Amino acid sequence: KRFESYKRDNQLPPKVRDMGIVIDQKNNTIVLPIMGRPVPFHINTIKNASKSDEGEWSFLRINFLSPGQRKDDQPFEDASAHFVRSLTFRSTDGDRYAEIANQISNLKREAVK
């Protein structure tokens, strides 16, 4: 049931300092750059990841597991909990985002074994 990405700041992957998306397969965790802060999200929290292209920009959408993504019922022991449902990033590195989407999908599948 209970999982946990990191316990301490020094366990974050060093490339976090570049304010980029980091996959830490080791800790079953992805680290997302939000407003100057490296934010961990455990793989057990993630539904799926998708890449898309519109013009010169590529898009990475990560969908999270949440009620509806209703009744009944949940194992979070927090009935009134708010959830992060999804977030979207954009970049010009189309091949990098294609790799990221695959690593996440590939991680997720072990997670659901």
Binding site: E4, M35, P40, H42, A81, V84, R85
Partner: protein
């Protein structure tokens, strides 16, 4: 004691280039390595301050008016000096504010004075300043979309990274 307290290699609001940070009795000033305008903040608009680890260490300044000033690149050793500055000059306690590292996506989205904060068991996972938000939309039940303009209003902090934040969606029960 000192007239000026200076700190080197500091980034202001996700600046790409570091700069020099000087603290005085009347407020703070930041000056970039060469390319860009200097920033100033008068003591009269310094309402609060938070200390935490970010992409070195960050001093987050909360204005009396609604707004956040982010200064990261400090060393861990810099805390005691900074705490004295804010207490003696700014009548403010530099709060030690640990962020959550468990990687959960459930908790509480709280609309504060200057930021939308997502708390995991009462510790912030991340914060979104209102000044960065281009739009807030109901996306269904019970879903709110928070959109940014990294590329009218402009979201500079959303676009400071190579991976630009475009949108965040929250599931928040009881507004539908």
């Amino acid at each position: 004691m000192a007239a000026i307290e200076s700190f080197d290699h500091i980034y202001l609001d996700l600046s790409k280039e570091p700069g020099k940070c000087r603290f005085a009795e009347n407020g703070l000033g930041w000056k970039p390595v060469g390319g860009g305008e200097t920033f100033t903040l008068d003591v009269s608009n310094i309402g609060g301050a938070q200390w935490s680890r970010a992409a070195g260490y960050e001093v987050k300044i909360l204005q009396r008016t609604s707004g956040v000033i982010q200064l990261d690149g400090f060393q861990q050793e810099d805390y005691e000096r900074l705490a004295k500055i804010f207490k003696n000059w700014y009548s403010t306690n530099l709060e030690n504010k640990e962020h959550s590292l468990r990687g959960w996506n459930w908790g509480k989205a709280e609309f504060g004075k200057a930021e939308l904060t997502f708390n995991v068991q009462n510790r912030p996972a991340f914060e979104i300043p209102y000044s960065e938000i281009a739009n807030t939309n109901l996306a269904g039940r019970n879903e709110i979309a928070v959109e940014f303009a990294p590329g009218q209003v402009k979201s500079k902090k959303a676009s400071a990274s190579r991976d630009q934040l475009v949108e965040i969606r929250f599931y928040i029960p009881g507004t539908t």
